[PDB]
Design a protein around this ligand. Structure first.
Ligand SMILES: O=P(O)(O)C[C@H](O)Cn1cncn1
Ligand SMILES: O=P(O)(O)C[C@H](O)Cn1cncn1
Ligand SMILES: O=P(O)(O)C[C@H](O)Cn1cncn1
Ligand SMILES: O=P(O)(O)C[C@H](O)Cn1cncn1
Ligand SMILES: O=P(O)(O)C[C@H](O)Cn1cncn1
Ligand SMILES: O=P(O)(O)C[C@H](O)Cn1cncn1
Ligand SMILES: [Mg+2]
Ligand SMILES: [Mn+2]
Ligand SMILES: [Mn+2]
Ligand SMILES: [Mn+2]
Ligand SMILES: [Mn+2]
Ligand SMILES: [Mn+2]
Ligand SMILES: [Mn+2]
Ligand SMILES: [Mn+2]
Ligand SMILES: [Mn+2]
Ligand SMILES: [Mn+2]
Ligand SMILES: [Mn+2]
Ligand SMILES: [Mn+2]
Ligand SMILES: [Mn+2]
Lengths: 195, 194, 195, 195, 194, 195
């Protein structure tokens, strides 16, 4: 019932996403970048979202337009799947480790696009995904989802652990934030409106 | 789980009605608009129902009003919980507002204590002095007879910092007073929460 | 009910534990060290675990082999009680204070033994339990339980408050992580296996 | 005969290892990552182990799951091959240089999984093996082998020399630790048990 | 290669029997359990057989007991070696215990000397004062008439540090006293090891 | 028998060396510099080498050409005495103290000439051997022996003790490295060649 399909095409990328918020965690993601597929796969699995994604992008240039545009379209789908912002918890937070790494994510379904991202990534790339694109993906996702997202890797020593723990924490926090809670028609805001 | 408290001194005359198992509605008139907004947010995100009126000595400053509102609110919270059994006891939450992020942690401990760190930079937000904001939280915690930790981890806008703090506090309080497990269990290894 | 009984003996210690994860918080714990007893009693109480433990140890040497071996056996019991790692939340986190002290624990039922522990204890002992054994207990528990455990005392000033807040937080995080959630046969991992 | 065959399958990797502790140094290792194959070949050669390894892994993501899971299975095979922990030296240590680099490894067949690893690598990758995975390999090996491993690169200027000197030292130290020494049934522990 | 030594003062009364070519068995009763554990580890990992009893002045503190036990143990070790010929002379080893790592280096030199650095942080381990731990190793080396270097390179648990140090010492002593090469050869360019 | 003789003459020095690797520690060394004789005598004794050496050198200039050329000739002799690099341990390491001084030596019979030497000598001369010539002797030995040598004085306070502990440690490491071990035809390298 809470789902969305979004298609988007530019000169750089051509993307389709299908998203169900009330899923079982199944993913079929092919961005053209394996490590990004793994991160979005983790996001779906731990968020209990169902996610289908295809991207034909300009990887001959670099991984940037693909990664950013996948995040944009994912964010748009999440926004649409949420629907009217009523009857939900609105706020979610979670910690997820991976071995020595620990990450925290905090989500506010605010209708104010904003993100604060600090992943402490040390390397240049994880597989074929540039580390600089990893915060960019979370920022672009948050702004297109029209929500407020804070993600911090508190510490760690392995960048795959850092990134993955961040996606896992993000997934758990998003899941909590969009959970139905209390009266179905209550807007969870003192101003009575979440656009 | 509702309580009504009335309290009058030479500085302030206050009435509060608080229900723990509400829908978030509030009617809060402290005399200070920003404080009203903070307690409205507390009620909204705690799913508490809160009525509050204060006739206070604002011609002096905002201090006695804000503190006493916190004192009476805390007394009402303590009373509304009633016997400290069958509840989660511990709650914690994060709430942002844009660039600011706050955490609140609550222990329904019967030991009044607060650790508050809001990183507010300004002198006032509207007519509420920034120094009164941690004082409100501390006074609330002590009169509620509980342990409260509130940290603004970072931010750049004092309205965002303060409001994120009240939202996080609301969420943690809601969790801590949630009924969970056997109704008669005291959630303490010492068997007593006074 | 998810329960386990474990008996272990070496030349240093002879220990028996019985643990139920789906308990009411009852404990009957006698390790030979009162403060360790109190910490394990707080663990069971706030975890809603039921815990029986006896240790006949070598306290004439010091508190080390007793404390460590109690953690090993408790960890083994926890691992065995969880049984097949399916149908559970897998991730838990919690904060617990005690007056001026605040602790955070994060749990990942990962089948990867790992612990990151930072308790900020200033004393040599609390009662008859050496402070250096308190992180060792958490690390040994985590590794024998085959899970990932992160425990941090953020701040405080009383070592009994710090240690107890740590065990309380740990309890609450373990309780969340082992809570049944979603389809009973789902393995909460993108790799489909948690051994 | 001190030998083992171990197989392991997840959604990320499918691996088989065959190992003899009392070998001549022969290796047939194909992880999918040439530099890792070279390190493991070195380990077998200088440890006088015989090692066969095959991994079908998710290298399209990155080198992490392959490398980690190869180390996990290798460690498990080591644990099994040692068998009952009696009649062996238990402790091993060795230094190995490669030109300007010098490494030390220390092994304790302890039945307590722990590793302390400090390789001082400066690069992002050596061949297709990410440098961050090299400590992760040694740590995962040690924990799966249920032993205590300390490896330090003391100094050096070339990461291939640093990593290779570390595997060489590890090989020599492991060879020493599992060498039969003294009465066949003596347990090398004051507590009389090494599980 | 066995020796028996008995020593009595107004502080302590000690008997030791030590065999170098043992299986690692021990019966050590110093009156201090953690010291017993360390000397048991020493015997076990050195493949020495060690008997020790001490009736000491533990009402004062652990010092005279611990020191005199090390003194007598060292004297026994010196005597058990006998004429310093046909041995390796030099020994070294590392031993960890979990996060801690120690190194010991032995030279059967007939020059009493020790360099000890265990990085212990606590005041006591059980009833053995941490400051007595290096003193034990030093007093052992001087009475054994040898050169001993023991370093805890790093660690975080003092029982692990001390225990790793005794294990490494044991392994190094075992190597140093191992028979190797012609039985009459003195392992010194000066042709004498007194 | 693993023995060699080398005779070498330049306008600066005239040297004859005879070396046996499988000796009893006997030496007869006359370099012209007593302290250097004492160091090479210690090396022979603790390596269980037999060594004869005579140098007629330009001591009226300084100790340099003598000390370096003795090291060169000795290294050449060591290389010839080893012969085919097969059937040996290849790697050796050792610590030797002398009173307050402690030194570590590590040897790799690598066929790659390289030395890393750090003796921490404070004086100008020990007897008639200039302190700067002591690391020069070790480096020139290693490079002429065609092997990798690392020697460190970890600490100390007496330069005779530091130097002598260094030569003792070197001797012990060299003895271990050239010890016969395993099949006599095996080449102890993954590349199958030690030239
Ligand atoms: O978070 P909201 O939109 O529910 C209500 C806030 O009062 C709005 N706000 C935005 N900046 C400061 N306050
Ligand atoms: O948190 P409680 O009151 O349930 C039990 C604690 O053991 C009491 N305590 C308070 N300071 C130290 N311990
Ligand atoms: O957390 P898991 O085992 O469910 C899946 C991870 O992808 C495995 N992993 C372990 N290190 C890096 N990734
Ligand atoms: O190393 P072991 O297990 O042979 C004997 C040790 O006494 C056990 N131990 C583990 N931590 C402190 N001691
Ligand atoms: O180690 P030794 O006694 O075999 C021979 C040394 O040369 C003696 N010495 C002691 N200080 C300096 N040299
Ligand atoms: O140490 P070797 O020559 O047995 C084999 C090495 O792989 C060769 N090498 C030299 N530099 C890097 N590797
Ligand atoms: Mg010749
Ligand atoms: Mn961009
Ligand atoms: Mn992964
Ligand atoms: Mn006041
Ligand atoms: Mn506002
Ligand atoms: Mn221990
Ligand atoms: Mn307590
Ligand atoms: Mn990993
Ligand atoms: Mn190489
Ligand atoms: Mn003394
Ligand atoms: Mn011990
Ligand atoms: Mn020169
Ligand atoms: Mn000398």
């Amino acid at each position: 019932k809470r789902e969305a399909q979004v298609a988007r095409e530019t000169g750089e990328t051509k993307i389709e996403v299908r998203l169900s918020l009330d899923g079982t965690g199944v993913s079929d993601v092919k961005t053209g970048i394996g490590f990004l597929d793994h991160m979005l796969s983790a996001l779906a699995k731990h968020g209990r979202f169902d996610l289908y994604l295809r991207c034909a992008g300009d990887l001959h240039v670099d991984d940037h337009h693909t990664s950013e545009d996948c995040a944009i379209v994912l964010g748009q789908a999440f926004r649409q799947a949420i629907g009217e912002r009523k009857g939900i918890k609105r706020y979610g937070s979670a910690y997820a480790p991976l071995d020595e790494s620990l990450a925290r994510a905090v989500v506010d379904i605010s209708s104010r696009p904003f993100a604060v991202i600090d992943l402490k990534l040390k390397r240049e790339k994880i597989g074929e995904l540039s580390c600089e694109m990893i915060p960019h993906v979370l920022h672009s996702f948050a702004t297109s989802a029209n929500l407020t997202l804070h993600v911090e890797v508190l510490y760690g020593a392995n960048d795959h652990h850092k990134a993955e723990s961040a996606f896992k924490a993000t997934a758990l926090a998003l899941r909590e934030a969009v959970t139905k809670d209390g009266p179905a028609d209550a807007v969870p805001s003192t101003k009575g409106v979440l656009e």
